[PDB]
């Protein structure tokens, strides 16, 4: 296996500092120029930071002077001293080995906020009362109020992957709201259950609703 | 540095055919080894970048050989035959020549398919939601296209425009429609002074619109 993970991100006032690391399965630091690279919204990616295998860094201007980047070479982990963050440094941070076979991680996000999480609210999507129609349903959970992104929201534990949408969210007065739908055969529904479970990863909330329920 | 250039978007394709997406350099990427170091990458809708193609000619693992790059000096184009719906998302060509690396602004692909008209539901609030003292009502325009369309909400058949937010969906990977979710948002004190919601979509699939509600007091 061959893997880069990143972590260490999380809310951090302007001003303050935040050190995020980077882990590896089947790359070995020390032999590579490893960097970090960031991605804003619609902006194009980032380089952030590269030292070379010999220790040589290099950095560019926006950042320059306030992040520095270094390597355990015997623990195997590299890492980014951010520091007096600014509110445009929010971004998903990546710790990528650049040469040869280009290889980066998931992603860790870094928000420079003075807010605080928040867990979202989650709501079932039902259709009212009334007489039915139709040989299929569709269904949803709506997901509100919550801080910072991201948020996931698996449908029957992800046996119902083909027939969902996922709503990107929208921001108003600090907080998010998404929603995702599922569409399924009217015959088995409301006669079996379904369930939209939605991960926060940055509250560590998960919650499930189910939709007759 | 090394800019590279490409457009953000391609011009539409139809599934099975094949497109391109061009990448152009300030500077040659051919070091003196002869190895051009020149890689792509693709976003897809809700997932993370994943590599292509590096050094110009070697496909990365899980990558179907009908991805292609070449090219010469300053002027590179990635090719995709037969062109498949989960294609689509944004392909980005970067160079790893030079410290620092460079990266292209992104080309969407974007495929032409068969119109379809958007599935409406709308759903009232959650008991849950209410008990709170708020009130969403959310309607969903589902797998239409083209991506044009307009939503309007009635309540009692009078338009309604405050507390409305809209949120559309990048091209499926599945079926390359779109869609979208409308949400209006009240007090539980004023959804419960009117009975009737309304959703309406207009799409160029008919002059009609499609229009959805519920009554608040049938049941």
């Known amino acids: 296996e061959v893997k880069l993970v990143e972590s260490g991100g999380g809310l951090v006032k302007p001003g303050g500092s935040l050190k995020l690391s980077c882990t590896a399965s089947?790359?070995?630091?020390?032999?590579?120029?490893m960097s970090w690279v960031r991605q804003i919204p619609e902006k194009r990616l980032e380089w952030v930071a590269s030292i070379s295998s010999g220790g040589i860094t290099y950095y560019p201007d926006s950042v320059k002077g306030r992040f520095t980047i270094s390597r355990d070479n015997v623990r195997n982990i590299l890492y980014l001293q951010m520091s007096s963050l600014r509110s445009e440094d929010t971004a998903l941070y990546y710790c990528?080995?650049?040469?040869?076979?280009?290889?980066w991680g998931q992603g860790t996000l870094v928000t420079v906020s003075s807010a605080k999480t928040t867990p979202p609210s989650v709501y079932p999507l039902a259709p009212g009362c009334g007489d039915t129609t139709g040989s299929s349903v569709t269904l949803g959970c709506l997901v509100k109020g919550y801080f910072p992104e991201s948020v996931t929201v698996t449908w029957n534990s992800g046996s119902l992957s083909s027939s969902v949408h996922t709503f990107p969210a929208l921001l108003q007065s600090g907080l998010y709201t998404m929603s995702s739908s599922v569409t399924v055969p009217s015959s088995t529904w409301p006669s079996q259950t379904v369930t939209c479970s939605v991960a926060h990863p940055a509250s560590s909330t998960t919650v499930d609703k189910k939709l007759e329920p | 540095d090394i800019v590279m250039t490409q457009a953000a978007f391609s011009n539409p394709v139809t599934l099975g055919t094949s497109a391109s997406i061009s990448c152009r350099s300030t500077?040659?990427?051919?070091?003196?080894?002869?190895?051009?170091?020149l890689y792509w990458y693709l976003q897809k809708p809700g997932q993370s970048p994943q590599l292509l193609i590096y050094?110009?000619?070697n496909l990365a693992s899980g990558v179907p050989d009908r991805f292609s790059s070449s090219g010469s000096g300053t002027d590179f184009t990635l090719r995709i035959s037969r062109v498949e719906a989960e294609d689509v998302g944004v392909y980005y060509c970067?160079?790893?020549?030079?410290?620092?690396?460079?990266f292209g602004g992104g080309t969407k692909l974007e495929i032409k398919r068969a119109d379809a008209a958007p599935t409406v539901s709308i759903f009232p609030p959650s008991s849950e939601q209410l008990t709170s003292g708020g009130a969403s009502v959310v309607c969903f325009l589902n797998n239409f296209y083209p991506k044009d369309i307009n939503v309007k909400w009635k309540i009692d058949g009078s338009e309604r425009q405050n507390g409305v937010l809209n949120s559309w969906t990048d091209q499926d990977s599945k079926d390359s429609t779109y869609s979208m979710s409308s949400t209006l948002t009240l007090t539980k004190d004023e959804y419960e002074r009117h009975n009737s919601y309304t959703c309406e979509a207009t799409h160029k699939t008919s002059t009609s619109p499609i229009v959805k509600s519920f009554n608040r007091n049938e049941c």
């Open positions: 990528a080995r650049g040469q040869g076979r280009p290889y």
């Open positions: 500077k040659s990427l051919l070091h003196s080894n002869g190895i051009t170091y």
């Open positions: 089947g790359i070995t630091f020390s032999r590579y120029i």
């Open positions: 050094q110009m000619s």
């Open positions: 970067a160079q790893n020549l030079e410290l620092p690396p460079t």
